Paper text:
Crenarchaea, one of the two major phyla of cultured archaea, possesses a number of small and basic chromatin proteins, including Sul7d, CC1 and Cren7. In Sulfolobus solfataricus P2, a model strain of Crenarchaeota, Cren7 is synthesized in abundance, constituting ~1% of the total cellular proteins. This protein preferentially binds dsDNA over ssDNA and changes the DNA geometry in vitro. Similar to other Cren7-DNA complexes reported previously, Cren7 binds to the mismatched DNA duplex in the minor groove as a monomer, covering almost all the eight base pairs.
Meanwhile, two complexes are in the asymmetric unit of Cren7-GTGATCGC, which are related by a perfect non-crystallographic 2-fold symmetry axis with a root-mean-square deviation (RMSD) value of 0.018 Å between them. By contrast, both T:G mispairs in the GC-rich DNA duplex (GTGATCGC) retained classic wobble type. To learn more about the atomic details of the unusual T2:G15 base pairing, the structures of all the T:G mispairs in the Cren7-DNA complexes are compared. Both T:G base pairs in the Cren7-GTGATCGC complex form a classic wobble pair with hydrogen bonds from G-O6 to T-N3 (2.74 Å for G7:T10 and 2.72 Å for G15:T2) and from G-N1 to T-O2 (2.91 Å for G7:T10 and 2.83 Å for G15:T2). The bound Cren7 induces a sharp kink (~50°) to the major groove by the intercalation of the side chain of Leu28 into the A3A4 step of d(GTAATTGC)2, while a smaller kink (~48°) is observed at the G3A4 step for d(GTGATCGC)2. The average conformational parameters of the base pair steps in GTGATCGC resembles those in GCGATCGC bound by Cren7. It suggests that the existence of T:G mispairs has little effects on the conformation of GC-rich DNA bound by Cren7. A similar case is found for GTGATCGC, with the values of the corresponding steps being about 15.4°and 18.8°, respectively. Cren7 showed a 1.3-fold reduction in the binding affinity for GTGATCGC as compared to that for GCGATCGC. This was resulted from the combined effects of a slightly decreased association rate (ka) and a slightly increased dissociation rate (kd), indicating that the presence of T:G wobble base pairs had limited effects on both Cren7-DNA contacts and the stability of Cren7-DNA complex. Although predictions based on pairing of the complementary bases and the stacking of pairs suggested no obvious sequence dependent base pair opening probabilities, Cren7 may prefer to induce the opening of T:G base pair in the AT-rich DNA sequences, as the fact that both T:G base pairs in the Cren7-GTGATCGC complex retain the classic wobble type.
Author numbering: 2 to 60
DNA sequence: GTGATCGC
DNA sequence: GTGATCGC
């Protein structure tokens, strides 16, 4: 499940950026809220990283 | 510990 | 096979 809307993320290199996650999913235990997680690629470094998504980002 | 995901 | 992602 890939993303469409950009997300404001802090990259591994330390910079603020607005990137479209390549994949998004819910990361939540049974009976608990959890978080939403996006898999991102830093356009500068080429490095993949995971980052929290806003709670209303569409999964 | 829990939850899913995948580049490394 | 799992680090790293988060809030509970």
């Amino acid at each position: 499940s890939s993303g469409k809307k950009p997300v404001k993320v802090k990259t591994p290199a330390g910079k603020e950026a607005e990137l479209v996650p390549e994949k998004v999913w819910a990361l939540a235990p049974k009976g608990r809220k959890g978080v939403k997680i996006g898999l991102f690629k830093d356009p500068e470094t080429g490095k993949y990283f995971r980052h929290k998504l806003p709670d209303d980002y569409p999964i």
